[PDB]
Design a protein around this ligand. Structure first.
Ligand SMILES: *[C@@H]1O[C@H](CO)[C@@H](O)[C@H](O)[C@H]1NC(C)=O
Lengths: 50, 24
């Protein structure tokens, strides 16, 4: 009821569970790819594997 | 009715490539 005390009011819940695996990513964060480089010493990031 | 399974029923335990190695 709209008059309820704070503990007895309704609350919405969302739980976000992450399928974090060494497998093909399909949800990814806002990020831009570079071109690929080979046969040279580079810093790198593949899907979050820095 | 019955049969012996011998060495059936093993599977790839995780999605990681490994080679020339013994793993537990
Ligand atoms: C499997 O179990 C049965 C009794 O449940 C037994 O008679 C049989 O010998 C066993 N299977 C094999 C392949 O020996």
């Amino acid at each position: 009821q709209p008059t309820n005390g704070v503990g007895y009011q309704p609350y919405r819940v969302v739980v976000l569970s992450f399928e974090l695996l060494h497998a093909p990513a399909t949800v990814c964060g806002p990020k831009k790819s570079t071109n690929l480089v080979k046969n040279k010493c580079v810093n790198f990031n593949f899907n979050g594997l820095t | 009715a019955y049969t012996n399974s011998f060495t059936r029923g093993v599977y790839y335990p995780d999605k990681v490539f490994r080679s020339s190695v013994l793993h537990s």
